[PDB]
């Protein structure tokens, strides 16, 4: 009833098509949009699922010259004698009503978000199951998107496990630190992460204008002397900050902070960026946190009078993150892999003791959210 | 005179340090910023050039307890007995005056831009020279940044040349189309670029939320039947559009357009994004164009009444690009490589004739602007 055509007609000087569906709901489709989206072989390359029609070929003042229909299709003639057919189900999906557009956006981008604090139950799946079964890999990426973190247990205690997960997703995101990288204490460390020091809450790689969307960390070796993990839900924290200190939120969401990374690893590098620590979309919603206190530059590109208020705001944000109601602490064992949203979560590590042998070794990698989302879309289709 | 300290003192309840330089100019440094940027080994990891000091350790209401100085250094005691030394040259560079901050930003990000239209003289360098000499690679990337395109002549007519340029920069940007990819007519083409068809002005890969910053295209084989290249300076075009049709500019700079790419190449993919075609920074300056008419989705997530005005605006933008005063046309020969800013330029190709043998073959790749800028910073240092 809902996707069967009861009537189709051209309206508004023939600039709109109206469909009355068999449930009595109506949908409206601008003529210019219909013409732009003609699925014929002249206009559309089926092997690519892509538009061949050029903007230059589109008459933006076009109207429908003739229309007939049956229950499942509309058949249109255009003023220049071009001819198009549209399927009812295809039309129904693309209905310009707010409800229809919103449903479809939800299907494309999986916006469902579950905020959490210290009560978090760490979502956990088996490593080999995720590699082997689409049902398990689907639960993995869907939960990663919704909650922001999934622990995978039962991987080996040798290098190469993150690279498997990389292939399962698609491919990993190369940076100056390598295709994958080893978190261990290193002589002449090129990064604070490669020491035994504490890492306070941070996101990885704000020195890039497009920080890694997803991070993977695999525990090869763990130390008993410290090195526990800590995470916080940055979107939850930002919401709390906006309520408790709107001025602190305003400053952190509007001030461009410079980040820097200079050194040598996979290649020699001298990297500089600017980010707002709390990054909002055009509707004021938080979409990314960009903050690593190690790589925040000494250079600070703001008028003098804005400096101390910035630091006061940063301090409030960091104190919120550290609150016992916000943070979740846990410890990785060998064979554990954590995979998390590096745009939303902030993560940290407790200091541990240095010594002559390597007491602690994680292998890590990054993936682009678009690569992850692509796999998520494909997995959903295969599982449903 | 300019970087020699004549006087240093604590002011404003000791919350600011003022330096009077030997040229009689004054600079001001907030105490909290000084403390945050203590270069001692407790606060700062020299091997990493990174801050160890945590936000949690920073008293945002800190003032200077004591200060002495000589011509080249200031020596500060803090209320908790921490002790810091700062060098005059380091201070001078980081002066919070608008002039000093702006100079430094120019040094970090190379903002100099030369807009062009059909009068463009295509900047051209030798391929092997760029691989061999830092002077030539510096001219390459600096010109790429400033003008938006450089042609390199005298490469071979075999695959593997873009990969050399990749290593010269650092590394290339992997996508679903491969580490590098072959632009040729293909049976069951997964993309319109892999056909003999015309490509209208576009940017590459708006189906990604972070499109490739820099594109490389190397001509292995060229056809006499068509396949000329065309480019336009998108920042120049946007400026013209803002003047001729502010409403068209407003629409294209505020409307989120959906892009899509589904298929199989390096991996299987189902990619979706949203972009504003004219993407502005927080000051209203154009920073990226996101537009490929082939990969613009059939899905269009806007209220019905906004649809036809969007298309009318797009048409005006495309007509401007196509204007004889804006576009620059040229033809690649075997051994030519073009390298260009895929955020600023739009590029295209003329159709050519299909046949039984391959008549036309380019090898292409992408690089991230941050990777390119890093090399540019290093090269400038080595050359100066
Ligand atoms: C590359 C992995 N590593 C060193 C753990 N982190 C890089 C990101 C960062 O320093 O912010
Ligand atoms: C990957 C290279 N290729 C096919 C030439 N272009 C991809 C970007 C695009 O379709 O917009
Ligand atoms: O070592 C850990 O537990 C966590 N490491 C990091 O956050 C890092 O390397 O960026
Ligand atoms: O084939 C050409 O001349 C140019 N190709 C493209 O713009 C492309 O493949 O994206
Ligand atoms: N069911 C209607 C089919 C119309 C075909 C028209 C071809 N020009
Ligand atoms: N030139 C002044 C040196 C001061 C050293 C102080 C160490 N606490
Ligand atoms: Zn139906
Ligand atoms: Zn058609
Ligand atoms: Zn980290
Ligand atoms: Zn290298
Ligand atoms: Zn000096
Ligand atoms: Zn110190
Ligand atoms: Zn292209
Ligand atoms: Zn694959």
From Swiss-Prot, chains A, B:
Q: Which UniProt keywords apply?
A: Carnitine biosynthesis, Cytoplasm, Dioxygenase, Iron, Metal-binding, Oxidoreductase, Phosphoprotein, Zinc
What are the protein's GO molecular function terms?
gamma-butyrobetaine dioxygenase activity; identical protein binding; iron ion binding; zinc ion binding
Q: What tissues is it present in? A: Highly expressed in kidney; moderately expressed in liver; very low expression in brain.
**Pathway involvement?**
Amine and polyamine biosynthesis; carnitine biosynthesis
Q: Where does Fe cation bind?
A: 202, 204, 347
- Chain positions found as Phosphoserine: 351
**Record's cofactor remark:** Binds 1 Fe(2+) ion per subunit.
Q: Which cofactor does it need?
A: Fe(2+); L-ascorbate
**Pfam families on file:** GBBH-like_N (PF06155), TauD (PF02668)
Subcellular location as annotated: Cytoplasm
Catalytic reaction(s) noted:
4-(trimethylamino)butanoate + 2-oxoglutarate + O2 = carnitine + succinate + CO2
State which Enzyme Commission number(s) the record gives: 1.14.11.1
A Gene Ontology term for the protein's cellular component = extracellular exosome
Name the family.
Belongs to the gamma-BBH/TMLD family.
Question: What is the protein name stated in its UniProt record?
Answer: Gamma-butyrobetaine dioxygenase
Recorded source organism is Homo sapiens
């Amino acid at each position: 009833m809902a996707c069967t055509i009861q009537k189709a007609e051209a309206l508004d000087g023939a600039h709109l098509m109206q469909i009355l569906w068999y449930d009595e709901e109506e949908s409206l489709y601008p003529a210019v949009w219909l013409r732009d989206n003609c699925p014929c072989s002249d206009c559309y390359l089926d092997s690519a699922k892509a538009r061949k029609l050029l903007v230059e070929a589109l008459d933006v003042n076009i109207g429908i010259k003739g229309l007939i229909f049956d229950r499942k299709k509309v058949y249109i003639t255009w003023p220049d004698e071009h001819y198009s057919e549209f399927q009812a189900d295809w039309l129904k999906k693309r209905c310009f009503s707010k409800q229809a557009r919103a449903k479809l956006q939800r299907e494309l981008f999986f916006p469902e978000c579950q905020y959490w604090g210290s009560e978090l139950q760490l979502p956990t799946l088996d490593f080999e199951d995720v590699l082997r079964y689409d049902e398990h890999a689907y639960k993995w990426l869907s939960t990663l998107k919704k909650v922001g973190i999934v622990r995978l247990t039962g991987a080996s205690d040798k290098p190469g496990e993150v690279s498997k997960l990389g292939k399962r997703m698609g491919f990993l995101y190369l940076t100056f630190y390598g295709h994958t990288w080893q978190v261990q204490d290193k002589i002449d460390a090129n990064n604070v992460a490669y020491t035994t020091g504490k890492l306070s809450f941070h996101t990885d790689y704000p020195a890039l204008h497009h920080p890694p969307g997803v991070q993977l960390l695999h525990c090869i070796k763990q130390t008993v002397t410290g090195g526990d993990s800590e995470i916080v839900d940055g979107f939850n924290v930002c919401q709390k900050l906006k309520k408790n200190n709107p001025q602190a939120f305003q400053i952190l969401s509007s001030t461009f902070v410079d980040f820097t990374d200079i050194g040598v690893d996979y290649c020699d590098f001298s990297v500089q960026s600017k980010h707002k620590i709390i990054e909002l979309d055009d509707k004021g919603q938080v979409v990314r946190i960009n903050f690593n206190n190690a790589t925040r530059d000494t250079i600070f590109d703001v008028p003098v009078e804005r400096v101390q208020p910035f630091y006061a705001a940063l301090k409030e944000f960091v104190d919120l993150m550290n609150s016992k109601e916000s943070k979740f602490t846990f410890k990785m064992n060998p064979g554990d892999v954590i995979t998390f949203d590096n745009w939303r979560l902030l993560h940290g590590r407790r200091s541990y003791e240095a010594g002559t042998e390597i007491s602690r070794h994680l292998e890590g990698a990054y993936a682009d959210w678009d690569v992850v989302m692509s796999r998520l879309r494909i997995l959903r289709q295969r599982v449903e």
